[PDB]
Write a protein that binds this DNA or RNA. Structure first.
Lengths: 69, 24, 134, 106, 123
RNA sequence: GGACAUGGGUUAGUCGAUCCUAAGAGAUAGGGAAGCUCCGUAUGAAAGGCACGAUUUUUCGUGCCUAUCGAAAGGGAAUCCGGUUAAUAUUCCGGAACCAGAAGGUGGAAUCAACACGGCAACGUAAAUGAAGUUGGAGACGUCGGCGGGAGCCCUGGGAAGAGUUCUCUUUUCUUUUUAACAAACCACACCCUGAAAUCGGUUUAUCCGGAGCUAGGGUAUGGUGUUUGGAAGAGUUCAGCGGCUGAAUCCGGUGCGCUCUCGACGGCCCUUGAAAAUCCAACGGAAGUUG
């Protein structure tokens, strides 16, 4: 698995056709994990900020399959 | 308009196809 | 005083090891940036290939092209040599200011390249332009 | 907790190397590991080369060229001191044979 | 060679001796977002205007390249980098050209320093 | 009931065999032998290749240099965790990787100063053409002894969940407190640089080291079974309810002539010096070579 530290990188990989699905994981420390299943790697972005979390979630392309915890 | 049309070569490398403009 | 501006030498340490260089200017006293007996040198990175009676002028010129380099080198990493190479085109063009100024570094490198072109074509310092086989 | 070999090879040999791990399921288990890699030796002095990792022979094929070499003459084949001795010895003996040629030509 | 920082703090522009201007989006990648290789000589200085969305690159060839860079806080909105002008007619002495460029804090005024001792105020 | 009867049951690119060679077997060339067969393994063998060319008397010229079998403990490409069955799991299921091979595609890099730069150097960097030929390395190596590092285990101080005990005593007795391959970043005996050392110093448990450059100072390399994060808490575990579901907890540290494994740097021993090969990488060499 790969960790992505850049939000726009996460969007770019999500835009790429190899992206298959996305998971949003809400942890007990109010930190969210945006995980993106690609052909080769599970790309994970750890967003500790709430406001950046849902603007990213609405930033995700509508065609992509986003799934709850 | 012509100057900006001719000079718009952003980062594209192989996409830069000014070979045609240089011959034709 | 065997290392003077215009003396041919060999580099034994670094990327350009085994290459023959000409002492452009010696800083035997040392410098703040280089606290040792360093000397700036110009050398041949890619030696020209051998040529023959045959082959057209295109191929001869293609094989006669020379790629130089300029580098500050420690004395302990230089191996002095009896042959001497001198030309007024390569006197005083290099300095510390040239190394800090990268455009001057490239300009000096191109000037060294050109100067080596006329020198090789004129047939001077054939030993200096012959690669050393080790 | 006791462990078992993960393979049908008993007899701890130089190829049956194992390691103890704790799994996320709270289990003590063996992981079978390979023999350690080797830094390439120098061709003249025989010492290990500096700047190159310690991989198995087939494992070297996955590195890029710069990771398997040193940017110097004989880089990845000879050590720095070995190369320097090659350079000095070559030049000095060429100087010697030039002097002997001058002496014997007359 | 030199670096400049967007006022928002999320974008960095890198001037290089390799005749390249490097735009980095700190939230996009550790790799350069864009690479620009228009200058013919080593690029000396890069500067962003503190308020207006314009930035400039000064190189040793004597040409000052002026770019319009628009930045939005949106994630979708990648920064828009477009050429705007190529200021010329600057002298080169000892193969040294535009050494330093500075932007007016208020309006689109560019101060360019040459190797001949001249300061150009492009309005 | 391993008995009798009836059915069911073994899922792999990654684990082995297959591949390689070992001692050794064993064709071929040959020679023996009335023969069955024996000997022989690059030998008294014509034991096969590769490249260049306006197509050469449209009848080809010019150059250049060893079988096989034999190891489920040797060598060797690459898989982990959780779950699952009446019986199979590194094989199935879920999730997460990895190897080799192949083709072109996208993005970047070199190039009209053809085949990149930086560092005094050790050498570094995401790239960074290299044919024939030659050479080097890895594969690839004994045994013993202590020393140091890591991992698991053992041990231990608190916290939290239940459980045992409770005439009395015991802020306690016990259990549960877990984190894989893989991915990224990080991390000091050898080497380099300046400097020249005797009033000799440095230094190990073990006395080796230094004008062939000590000490000191600053660097380079090696770099996980280490740390930080991804995997990954959603899992697994422990408890409290509800009629599959809902709540919690799954925490913070210590220690060592300890144990097992492993790694590092060394010391000893030999009239003993402790495999090969397949594979893999590198160098030297310099053939070729506005588009391309």
């Amino acid at each position: 698995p790969r960790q992505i530290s850049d939000i726009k990188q996460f969007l770019e990989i999500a835009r790429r056709k190899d992206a298959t699905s996305a998971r949003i994981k809400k942890n007990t420390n109010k930190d969210v994990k945006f995980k993106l299943r690609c052909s080769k790697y599970l790309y994970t972005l750890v967003v500790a900020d709430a406001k950046k979390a849902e603007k990213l979630r609405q930033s995700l392309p509508p065609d992509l399959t986003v799934t709850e915890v | 308009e012509e100057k900006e049309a001719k000079e718009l070569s952003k980062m594209m490398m192989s996409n830069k196809q000014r070979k045609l403009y240089s011959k034709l | 005083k065997i290392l003077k501006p215009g003396k041919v030498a060999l580099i034994t340490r670094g990327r350009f090891a085994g290459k023959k260089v000409v002492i452009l200017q010696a800083i035997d006293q040392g410098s703040k940036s280089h606290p040792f007996g360093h000397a700036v040198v110009a050398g041949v990175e890619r030696y020209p290939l051998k040529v023959t009676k045959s082959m057209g002028a295109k191929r001869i010129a293609r094989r006669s092209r020379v790629k130089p380099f300029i580098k500050v080198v420690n004395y302990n990493h230089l191996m002095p040599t009896r042959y001497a190479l001198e030309l007024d085109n390569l006197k005083g063009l290099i300095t510390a200011d040239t190394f800090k100024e990268p455009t001057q570094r490239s300009a000096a490198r191109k000037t060294v390249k050109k100067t080596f072109e006329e020198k090789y074509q004129s047939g001077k310092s054939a030993w200096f332009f012959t690669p050393l086989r080790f | 907790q006791r462990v078992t070999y993960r393979r049908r090879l008993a007899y701890n040999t130089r190829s049956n190397r194992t390691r103890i791990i704790k799994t996320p399921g709270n289990n003590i288990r063996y992981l079978h590991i390979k023999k350690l890699g080797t830094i390439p030796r120098c061709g003249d002095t025989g010492v290990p080369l500096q700047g190159i990792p310690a991989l198995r022979p087939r494992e070297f094929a996955r590195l890029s060229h710069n990771k398997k070499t040193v940017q110097r003459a004989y880089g990845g084949c000879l050590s720095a001191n070995a190369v320097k001795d090659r350079i000095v010895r070559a030049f000095l003996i060429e100087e010697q044979k030039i002097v002997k040629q001058k002496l014997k030509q007359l | 060679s030199s670096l400049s920082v967007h006022s928002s703090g999320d974008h960095v522009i890198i001037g290089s001796y390799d005749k390249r201007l490097c735009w980095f989006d700190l939230d996009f990648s550790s790799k350069p977002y864009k690479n620009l290789r228009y200058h013919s000589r080593a690029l000396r200085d890069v500067s962003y205007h503190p308020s207006l969305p314009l930035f400039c690159s000064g190189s040793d060839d004597g040409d000052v390249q002026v770019f319009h860079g628009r930045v939005y806080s949106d994630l979708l909105a990648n920064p828009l980098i477009v050429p705007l002008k190529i200021l010329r007619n600057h002298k080169v002495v000892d193969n040294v050209g535009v050494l330093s460029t500075c932007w007016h804090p208020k309006e689109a005024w560019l101060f360019s320093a040459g190797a001949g001792g001249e300061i150009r105020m492009w309005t």
